[PDB]
Amino acid sequence: MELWLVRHGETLWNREGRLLGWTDLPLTAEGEAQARRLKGALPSLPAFSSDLLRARRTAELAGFSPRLYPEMREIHFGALEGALWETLDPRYKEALLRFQGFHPPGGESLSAFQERVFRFLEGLKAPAVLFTHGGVVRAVLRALGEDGLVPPGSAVAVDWPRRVLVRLALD
């Protein structure tokens, strides 16, 4: 199933290097610029989006009117929300780097996050554009055997659950 996943435009915590999960930050000026550049670069297909501000706004500026689903949200970092990556405990850094065995206090485990994301994707019965988060795109790309890191405001098209089709970044 052809699905286009879009990583929302940048927020302040991107340049600051802080874990951004359910903390509802707005897009930066550059983040909005990135979203605008997406208009005309994404296919005209039904759209869905995380209900968090940064995702919704990216969808809006990209020219879409998506149905909102909390299931498309970034992972909930719990007590680690806003934590500087730099000073994160080595065990947490490793868990996030290797994308496994991560369960922050008051948050969501990576395994629960994956189940949520993949269950949502399974429910899509036709091609669609999905405005979401870095961690969601990463989970999908990693499951397809590829490095899951993509720039803010960029997109990746996949034939779920078989292969990556294309990665699109704009300047």
Q: Does 74 qualify as catalytic in the annotation? A: yes
State how far Cα 89 lies from the chain centre.
Answer: 23
Residue 57 annotated in ligand binding: no
Residue 18 annotated in ligand binding: no
41 CB contacts (<8 Å, ≥6 apart)? 155, 168, 170
To one decimal, the resolution in angstroms is 1.8
Cα three-residue angle 43-45-49, rounded to 5 degrees: 100
Query: Technique behind this structure?
Result: X-ray
Structure tokens at 140: 């999908």
Cβ distance 151 to 38 under 8 Å?
no
Strand, helix or coil for residue 26: coil
Structure tokens at 169: 């970044």
Find, among 162, 163, 132, 138, the residue nearest to 150 by Cα. 138
Which one is catalytic: 30, 32, 74, 115? 74
Domains of the chain, each with CATH number or no CATH? 1-171 (3.40.50.1240)
